[PDB]
Symmetry: C3
Subunit: 153 residues, 3 copies
Amino acid sequence: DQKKPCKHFSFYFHDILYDGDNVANATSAAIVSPPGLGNFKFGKFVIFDGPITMDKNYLSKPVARAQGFYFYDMKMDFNSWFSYTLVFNSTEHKGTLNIMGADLMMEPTRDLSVVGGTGDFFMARGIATFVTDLFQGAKYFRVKMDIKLYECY
Amino acid sequence: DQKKPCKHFSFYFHDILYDGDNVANATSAAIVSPPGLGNFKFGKFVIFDGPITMDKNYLSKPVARAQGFYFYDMKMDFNSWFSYTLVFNSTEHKGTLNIMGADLMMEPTRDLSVVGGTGDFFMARGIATFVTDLFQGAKYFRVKMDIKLYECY
Amino acid sequence: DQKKPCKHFSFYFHDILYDGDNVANATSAAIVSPPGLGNFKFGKFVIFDGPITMDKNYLSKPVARAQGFYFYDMKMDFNSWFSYTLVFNSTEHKGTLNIMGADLMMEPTRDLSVVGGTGDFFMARGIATFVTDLFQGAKYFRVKMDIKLYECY
Ligand SMILES: *[C@@H]1O[C@H](CO)[C@@H](O[C@@H]2O[C@H](CO)[C@@H](O[C@@H]3O[C@H](CO[C@H]4O[C@H](CO)[C@@H](O)[C@H](O)[C@@H]4O)[C@@H](O)[C@H](O)[C@@H]3O[C@@H]3OC[C@@H](O)[C@H](O)[C@H]3O)[C@H](O)[C@H]2NC(C)=O)[C@H](O)[C@H]1NC(C)=O
Ligand SMILES: *[C@@H]1O[C@H](CO)[C@@H](O[C@@H]2O[C@H](CO)[C@@H](O[C@@H]3O[C@H](CO[C@H]4O[C@H](CO)[C@@H](O)[C@H](O)[C@@H]4O)[C@@H](O)[C@H](O)[C@@H]3O[C@@H]3OC[C@@H](O)[C@H](O)[C@H]3O)[C@H](O)[C@H]2NC(C)=O)[C@H](O)[C@H]1NC(C)=O
Ligand SMILES: *[C@@H]1O[C@H](CO)[C@@H](O[C@@H]2O[C@H](CO)[C@@H](O[C@@H]3O[C@H](CO[C@H]4O[C@H](CO)[C@@H](O)[C@H](O)[C@@H]4O)[C@@H](O)[C@H](O)[C@@H]3O[C@@H]3OC[C@@H](O)[C@H](O)[C@H]3O)[C@H](O)[C@H]2NC(C)=O)[C@H](O)[C@H]1NC(C)=O
Ligand SMILES: *[C@@H]1O[C@H](CO)[C@@H](O[C@@H]2O[C@H](CO)[C@@H](O)[C@H](O)[C@H]2NC(C)=O)[C@H](O)[C@H]1NC(C)=O
Ligand SMILES: *[C@@H]1O[C@H](CO)[C@@H](O[C@@H]2O[C@H](CO)[C@@H](O)[C@H](O)[C@H]2NC(C)=O)[C@H](O)[C@H]1NC(C)=O
Ligand SMILES: *[C@@H]1O[C@H](CO)[C@@H](O[C@@H]2O[C@H](CO)[C@@H](O)[C@H](O)[C@H]2NC(C)=O)[C@H](O)[C@H]1NC(C)=O
């Protein structure tokens, strides 16, 4: 509830969609075909369990995992919506952060809500800022996530 | 955390389901067939990007958009569940509100949670009240949404 | 925001998946086949309207209902993710609690966030702890849910 947060993390989320042939490498999978509302994959719904790394390499030792879903939701351009949990299980942090909101893909930056937390993040609340770092067609993307907590207990 | 909220909005959400033949007019689409648990569409899951208007006309200039999903979830009557973001991008408001909860369709009024907000709505929390204004078969519905924020920063 | 909560409930949630042939007994249904990312049902997505009971008997008089969804989300073992509403409509409690987070099935205990509440639970926030009480193959499971509110208005 102010400018500077009480806890700030910056790290990278990676998504490697299952393509029918890459079980070992994939971190996510679409569960439905898009219904066909426009040409930007409206309604394509993806469940993921992806790594959170401090650098841009999806093979780096993860500091957390992101588990949840996203879907595309715009008829005339790409737009998406997310709800997920960051799961920490390291000597450094043990706990979870729950996040949801609109991933406005057409914007240079966009904010989602940190709606709760557990463990070391008990009762957290704040903002999760997304910036796109890289996308490669429909096969891979990497998001820089900046977690800014404004309630820290 | 009291009777009167610190910010109160009242406006209308519109949903025009994709029917296979109305790409230009539709605002939402079902992504699955209902599995068949009863006759009230249990499990039908809809993603939407619909207009929020100050009057009851779905063609009015929107003051915001609602992006997210709903699904039906009752075996013996209609009931639904929502999670979505109200996205404001006007000279008046720029920001988002994140909302989720049970849309108890059989009740004259029902409340969902405002679980967070961003931008001009940074760290908002409160209640979103739904009343049904009109439904037309399975083709269209309009909900009056009353947003009552009880934390305003 | 402390050790002892301001309100604590402990009760059992029951899930009886629709199997194609048990409409009257089922409380939930999968809406998609799993896409095939591993052998632990990654991406299987289930919508539910199940009873909340004070004892372990799914036929006991419910004290509330749980309405929402879960999905499985791990490639190499079982893991799940939940978002739902506890709906109270008794002489004792009338209101709702909104809950979401990672149901870390491989852990003896795990915590989800109580992100909001309505009615008698207006503006609640806290933690929902899950422990598995029983699972029977893929047909039935029972979770002991411990609701710990840390903001009570
Ligand atoms: C697990 O999944 C990941 C993600 O999909 C796999 O990694 C991806 O692998 C592909 C190849 O299969 C790779 O694409 C190739 O990239 C090289 C390098 O491109 C970069 O460097 C160039 C300079 O050397 C630069 O000029 C480029 O702009 C890039 O920065 C290209 O030279 C190749 O042509 C190829 O590029 C692809 O070519 C086809 C085209 O359709 C496509 O758009 C284009 O991307 C990805 O870069 C790589 N991604 C990442 C994030 O590493 C990985 O192999 C999988 N692992 C297993 C075991 O399967
Ligand atoms: C985009 O989607 C919207 C929403 O689906 C489309 O608007 C809907 O269009 C239908 C016609 O296709 C229209 O239904 C018709 O309504 C008139 C008017 O009914 C009202 O006024 C009457 C008094 O004049 C009153 O007596 C009625 O009770 C209503 O208040 C009816 O006279 C027609 O018979 C028709 O009604 C439908 O008839 C068939 C029946 O199955 C159905 O239940 C019934 O609704 C909708 O009213 C209209 N909805 C809205 C919200 O405007 C719109 O055309 C689409 N646009 C494009 C470009 O495709
Ligand atoms: C609504 O759905 C519920 C949930 O699916 C149905 O209840 C389930 O019904 C099955 C039978 O269809 C029942 O399974 C049977 O359980 C008995 C009893 O087992 C317990 O007690 C034994 C001691 O008496 C103990 O030794 C066991 O370890 C158990 O504690 C078994 O003896 C049967 O063999 C059968 O067990 C099943 O056998 C096949 C095997 O594949 C399976 O894994 C195993 O479970 C469930 O226990 C019962 N569940 C609950 C929670 O009550 C109910 O009938 C449905 N109602 C309607 C109207 O259809
Ligand atoms: C968190 O990390 C711990 C450390 O490995 C995991 O638990 C240990 O898990 C291994 C299996 O990988 C067991 O063999 C050990 O007995 C566990 N040790 C203890 C002290 O519990 C745990 O499963 C991880 N939890 C996650 C990833 O959710
Ligand atoms: C919010 O509204 C602005 C105003 O149009 C959008 O951005 C402008 O977007 C147009 C494309 O429609 C660009 O051509 C302009 O260059 C943009 N201007 C500026 C100053 O950025 C923006 O995309 C909208 N965001 C939404 C709807 O999420
Ligand atoms: C909550 O419980 C009440 C009590 O039954 C439900 O409403 C009554 O609902 C019955 C239908 O079962 C109607 O015939 C009565 O007229 C209702 N009475 C009043 C005073 O409203 C209500 O539908 C339930 N709501 C839920 C389960 O969401």
